[PDB]
């Protein structure tokens, strides 16, 4: 069964340029992109038997196509990256149809560099439902990891997507509803992970009080 | 160049309704016979698996509900009684001309009763404001259909600009959305003014619901 293993993630500032790699195990190589939310973008395609090549006009001299044969490896490099370049990345093999996907490889491209978060509680206020969370702020880059409980406490969780801030970092936040009338027989603790910066935290959260 | 288009951008069904997916051509799709469109089946954070290709023929285990019909500038994807494995985003892709463009994308999502949200506002921690900025949070949990606005107010004028919302994606237990708001302040500008919050206007509410806080009564 047809299978392209793709490179893992990648974090590059802009004006420098980046290398994905597609393995292959099991006719043309495609390169398509999405950006975050976004429909897809197709970059070009590459025939390994003679090293043709052709590219969307928008990666004119950006792009480059390339595959090792001996490892059934394809490669797509792509020079000067932009703010507008992050997307995750995927080689297809096209059957002529795309009918083989690779798994993807984010790239970030950002001036921005390595920062853990500040973990903020949300308290609750007050009515029967509490709704309270952790406001895990100012990281860079994705991802983060959040639980509560150390994974007791899964239902009623809702951690939301990071928003990329006009800074330039990420912030995201992590809420839970519990029964009010468990507020002070039960204690709720966010865990934030985020790898790239070895940033682990554990934050206890709980109502405030001088009314 | 060659630009598809793809209607609706969201659909909402039930488990055994047919559905019908649009995706129309600036230009005509065929040559030599070969309709030169292709359907992909994409869900939130994998990635896309062809389900037809030639515009009617199923990709590999692809089951027969997968249906496509067209000819020319438009084309459609049929699917016959809606599995739940189905709710997904769809798109369309040209395959004549070479940029290989796809279409915008459309989003199957699940049907359900309308469900007000839940609607907190959270003020910002003592410990952010020390660092000397404001974070001003407001939650609606729960809820469905998924079109929703946001209004902060502050000291009853209402904000642009200074918010960013995220959703999550439908609960695949209950059906609904949630959705996170922040309202961010230096610590000087939110000292200034007493009243913070969060006015939500939903299908669910007869009226906009407020949630606020004062602040210095907190």
């Known amino acids: 069964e047809v299978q392209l293993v793709q490179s893992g993630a990648e974090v590059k500032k802009p004006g420098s340029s980046v290398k994905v790699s597609c393995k292959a195990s099991?006719?043309?190589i495609h390169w398509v992109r999405q950006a975050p939310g976004q429909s897809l973008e197709w970059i070009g395609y590459?025939?390994?038997?003679?090293?043709?090549?052709d590219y969307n006009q928008k990666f004119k001299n950006r792009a480059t196509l390339t595959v090792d044969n001996p490892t059934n490896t394809a490669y797509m490099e792509l020079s000067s990256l932009r703010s507008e370049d992050t997307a995750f990345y995927y080689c297809?093999?096209?059957?002529?149809?795309?009918?083989?996907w690779g798994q993807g490889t984010l790239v970030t491209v950002s001036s921005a560099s390595t920062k853990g978060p500040s973990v903020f509680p949300l308290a609750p206020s007050s009515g029967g439902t509490a709704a309270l969370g952790c406001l895990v702020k100012d990281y860079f880059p994705e991802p983060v990891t959040v639980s509560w409980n150390s994974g007791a406490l899964t239902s009623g969780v809702h951690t939301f997507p990071a928003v990329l801030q006009s800074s330039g970092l990420y912030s995201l936040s992590s809420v839970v509803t519990v029964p009010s009338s468990s507020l002070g027989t039960q204690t709720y603790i966010c865990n934030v992970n985020h790898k790239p910066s070895n940033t682990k935290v554990d934050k206890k959260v709980e109502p405030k009080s001088c009314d | 160049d060659i630009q598809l288009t793809q209607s609706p951008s969201t659909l909402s069904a039930s488990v055994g309704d047919r559905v019908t997916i649009t995706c129309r051509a600036s230009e005509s799709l065929d040559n030599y016979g070969i309709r030169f469109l292709t359907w992909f089946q994409q869900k939130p954070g994998k990635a896309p698996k062809l389900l037809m290709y030639a515009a009617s023929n199923q990709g590999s285990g692809v089951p027969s509900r997968f249906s496509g019909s067209g000819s020319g500038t438009e084309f459609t994807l049929t699917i016959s009684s809606l599995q739940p494995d189905d709710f997904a985003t769809y798109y369309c892709?040209?395959?004549?001309?070479?940029?290989?463009?796809f279409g915008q994308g459309t989003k199957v999502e699940v049907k359900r009763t309308v469900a007000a949200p839940s609607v907190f506002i959270f003020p910002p921690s003592d410990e952010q404001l020390k660092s000397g900025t404001a974070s001003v949070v407001c939650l609606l949990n729960n809820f469905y259909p998924r079109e929703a606005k946001v209004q902060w107010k502050v000291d009853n004028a209402l904000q642009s600009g200074n918010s960013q919302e995220s959703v999550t994606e439908q609960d695949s237990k209950d059906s609904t959305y949630s959705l996170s708001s922040t309202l961010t302040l230096s610590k000087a500008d939110y000292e200034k003014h007493k009243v913070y919050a969060c006015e939500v206007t939903h299908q669910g509410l007869s009226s906009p619901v407020t949630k606020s806080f004062n602040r210095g009564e907190c």
């Open positions: 590459i025939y390994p038997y003679n090293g043709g090549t």
């Open positions: 892709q040209q395959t004549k001309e070479v940029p290989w463009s």
């Open positions: 099991g006719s043309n």
């Open positions: 297809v093999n096209g059957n002529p149809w795309l009918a083989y």
